[PDB]
Design an enzyme around this catalytic site. Structure first.
Site, PDB file in Angstrom:
ATOM      1  N   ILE A  30       1.048  -1.954  -0.062  1.00 52.93           N
ATOM      2  CA  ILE A  30      -0.083  -0.252   0.186  1.00 52.93           C
ATOM      3  C   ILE A  30       0.711   1.642  -0.237  1.00 52.93           C
ATOM      4  O   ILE A  30       0.437   2.088   0.180  1.00 52.93           O
ATOM      5  CB  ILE A  30      -1.035   0.069   1.276  1.00 52.93           C
ATOM      6  CG1 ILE A  30      -0.294  -0.269   2.384  1.00 52.93           C
ATOM      7  CG2 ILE A  30      -2.511  -1.187   1.209  1.00 52.93           C
ATOM      8  CD1 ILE A  30      -2.141  -0.525   3.545  1.00 52.93           C
ATOM      9  N   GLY A  31       2.067   1.275  -0.324  1.00 53.98           N
ATOM     10  CA  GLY A  31       3.186   2.175  -0.076  1.00 53.98           C
ATOM     11  C   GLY A  31       4.580   2.101   1.062  1.00 53.98           C
ATOM     12  O   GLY A  31       5.085   0.667   1.522  1.00 53.98           O
ATOM     13  N   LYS A  32       5.493   3.514  -0.021  1.00 51.40           N
ATOM     14  CA  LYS A  32       6.742   3.692   0.917  1.00 51.40           C
ATOM     15  C   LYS A  32       6.518   4.996   2.367  1.00 51.40           C
ATOM     16  O   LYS A  32       5.210   5.480   2.170  1.00 51.40           O
ATOM     17  CB  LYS A  32       7.614   3.283   0.493  1.00 51.40           C
ATOM     18  CG  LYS A  32       9.132   3.804   1.077  1.00 51.40           C
ATOM     19  CD  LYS A  32       9.995   3.856  -1.100  1.00 51.40           C
ATOM     20  CE  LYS A  32      11.321   2.885  -1.049  1.00 51.40           C
ATOM     21  NZ  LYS A  32      11.979   3.845  -1.441  1.00 51.40           N
ATOM     22  N   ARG A  92       9.170   7.112   4.996  1.00 51.31           N
ATOM     23  CA  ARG A  92      10.460   7.873   4.671  1.00 51.31           C
ATOM     24  C   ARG A  92      11.284   6.367   4.365  1.00 51.31           C
ATOM     25  O   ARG A  92      12.422   6.131   3.224  1.00 51.31           O
ATOM     26  CB  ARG A  92      10.633   8.682   5.858  1.00 51.31           C
ATOM     27  CG  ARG A  92      12.139   9.061   6.032  1.00 51.31           C
ATOM     28  CD  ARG A  92      12.714  10.014   6.959  1.00 51.31           C
ATOM     29  NE  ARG A  92      12.123   9.525   8.434  1.00 51.31           N
ATOM     30  CZ  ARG A  92      11.648   8.952   9.060  1.00 51.31           C
ATOM     31  NH1 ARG A  92       9.683   9.378   9.136  1.00 51.31           N
ATOM     32  NH2 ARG A  92      11.202   8.492  10.252  1.00 51.31           N
ATOM     33  N   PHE A  93      11.423   5.291   5.710  1.00 49.05           N
ATOM     34  CA  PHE A  93      12.125   4.017   5.501  1.00 49.05           C
ATOM     35  C   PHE A  93      11.279   2.646   5.083  1.00 49.05           C
ATOM     36  O   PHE A  93      10.422   3.894   6.461  1.00 49.05           O
ATOM     37  CB  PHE A  93      13.014   4.152   5.971  1.00 49.05           C
ATOM     38  CG  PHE A  93      14.593   4.791   6.052  1.00 49.05           C
ATOM     39  CD1 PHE A  93      15.706   4.471   5.022  1.00 49.05           C
ATOM     40  CD2 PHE A  93      14.152   6.189   7.047  1.00 49.05           C
ATOM     41  CE1 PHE A  93      16.655   5.247   5.046  1.00 49.05           C
ATOM     42  CE2 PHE A  93      15.750   7.235   6.569  1.00 49.05           C
ATOM     43  CZ  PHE A  93      16.344   6.728   6.054  1.00 49.05           C
ATOM     44  N   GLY A  94      11.266   1.838   4.958  1.00 50.19           N
ATOM     45  CA  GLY A  94      10.059   0.935   4.668  1.00 50.19           C
ATOM     46  C   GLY A  94       8.560   1.139   4.022  1.00 50.19           C
ATOM     47  O   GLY A  94       9.085   2.098   3.123  1.00 50.19           O
ATOM     48  N   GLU A  95       8.476  -0.023   3.911  1.00 56.74           N
ATOM     49  CA  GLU A  95       7.373  -0.335   2.808  1.00 56.74           C
ATOM     50  C   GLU A  95       6.057  -0.845   3.775  1.00 56.74           C
ATOM     51  O   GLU A  95       6.150  -1.460   4.149  1.00 56.74           O
ATOM     52  CB  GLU A  95       7.935  -1.608   1.983  1.00 56.74           C
ATOM     53  CG  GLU A  95       7.302  -2.385   0.498  1.00 56.74           C
ATOM     54  CD  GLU A  95       7.315  -0.828  -0.231  1.00 56.74           C
ATOM     55  OE1 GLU A  95       6.467   0.118  -0.267  1.00 56.74           O
ATOM     56  OE2 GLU A  95       8.524  -0.804  -0.942  1.00 56.74           O
ATOM     57  N   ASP A 125       7.950  16.454  10.747  1.00 58.78           N
ATOM     58  CA  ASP A 125       7.082  16.470   9.194  1.00 58.78           C
ATOM     59  C   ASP A 125       6.058  16.311   9.504  1.00 58.78           C
ATOM     60  O   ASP A 125       5.696  15.232   8.317  1.00 58.78           O
ATOM     61  CB  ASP A 125       8.479  15.104   9.244  1.00 58.78           C
ATOM     62  CG  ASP A 125       8.409  15.452   7.709  1.00 58.78           C
ATOM     63  OD1 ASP A 125       8.305  16.051   6.991  1.00 58.78           O
ATOM     64  OD2 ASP A 125       8.433  13.939   6.837  1.00 58.78           O
TER      65      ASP A 125
END
Ligand SMILES: NC(=O)c1ccc(-c2nc(-c3ccccn3)c(-c3ccc4c(c3)OCO4)[nH]2)cc1
Length: 295
Positions: A12-14, A16-19, A134
């Site tokens: 379902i997406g990315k 900043r780091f990680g899937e 962020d």
């Protein structure tokens, strides 16, 4: 008994780091963010923030667990959270327009989550004040009930109020949403309140995104990111600095917003989040109060 029992179903997406994946845990949908072994510091820091005592709140993404899963070849580092089918506020605002009620719900819940993050709770099970660093529409999620919760807490900083110190050694975050003082590197990063103030500037930008999509009598604006009219899609710090710091521009407030009280209140909040001087900005608590009275 966490990771071992979850089955991944859909990418379902990315992060900043990680899937990020939609998974199933004891028959329930959950969100899973997966990091590799070389991203352990990122995974651990986000796990650490989410495990902060007394963090849970209806407007902060509900954290389930950090875990490891070894597939027989490599080890995955997992973060597991509540799943929200609408996904991000960014996705929601692209897909839909909102009513006046819907706008206020989204803005109030966002402000409530941030006010909670920002608030120190004193006591034996005390919560430190936390700044996000962020905040943007892509990391706020929309729940089925039409309220928001804040996610992506991996860049967050935590305050020790007795010493006036911060738990890590901190220009992180998304360039488009960086506060003037972040862009021009004048921010005093030894001062925790400075990080809170920077979060507020970014929340003002998010409120502008929401307000564009408030449809009254068939009238609304197309979805845009803040500064869509002034910078490239993936702007540099320099591109942002020239606009926000030098030319002193902010997102435009449409004339049709003055014709509606709810939109007037929102526009006034935006202006008061966008001051170049962080010390002049509204607090999240004050914004919450103002929107609560509006709701
Ligand atoms: N663009 C960014 O900087 C960005 C944007 C989004 C994330 C993010 N993280 C999660 C998440 C976090 C912890 C555990 C599971 N998912 C999720 C998440 C959590 C729950 C969800 C989801 C995404 O979609 C449906 O329900 N999104 C991270 C970084």
């Amino acid at each position: 008994t966490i990771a071992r029992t979850i089955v991944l179903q859909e990418s379902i997406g990315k992060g900043r780091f990680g899937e990020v994946w939609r998974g199933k845990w004891r028959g329930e949908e959950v969100a899973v963010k997966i990091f590799s072994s070389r991203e352990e510091r990122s995974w651990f820091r986000e796990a650490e923030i989410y495990q902060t005592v007394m963090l849970r709140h209806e407007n902060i993404l509900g954290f389930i667990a950090a875990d490891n899963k070894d597939n027989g070849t490599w080890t995955q580092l997992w973060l597991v959270s509540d799943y929200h089918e609408h996904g991000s506020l960014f996705d929601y605002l692209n897909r839909y327009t909102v009513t006046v009620e819907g706008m206020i719900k989204l803005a109030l819940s966002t402000a409530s989550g941030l006010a909670h993050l920002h608030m120190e709770i004193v006591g034996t099970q005390g919560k430190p004040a936390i700044a996000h660093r962020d905040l943007k529409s892509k990391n706020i999620l929309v729940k089925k009930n039409g309220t928001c919760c804040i996610a992506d807490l991996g860049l967050a900083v935590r305050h020790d109020s007795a010493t006036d110190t911060i738990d890590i050694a901190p220009r992180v975050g998304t360039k488009r949403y960086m506060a003037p003082e972040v862009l021009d590197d004048s921010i005093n990063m030894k001062h925790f309140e400075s990080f809170k103030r920077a979060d507020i500037y970014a929340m003002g930008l998010v409120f502008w995104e929401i307000a564009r999509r408030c449809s009254i009598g068939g009238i609304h604006e197309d979805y845009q990111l803040p500064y869509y009219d002034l910078v490239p899609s993936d702007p540099s710090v320099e591109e942002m600095r020239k606009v926000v710091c030098e030319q002193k521009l902010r997102p435009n407030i449409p004339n049709r917003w003055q014709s509606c009280e709810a939109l007037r209140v929102m526009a006034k909040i935006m202006r008061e989040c966008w001051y170049a001087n962080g010390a002049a900005r509204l607090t999240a608590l004050r914004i919450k109060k103002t929107l609560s009275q509006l709701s």
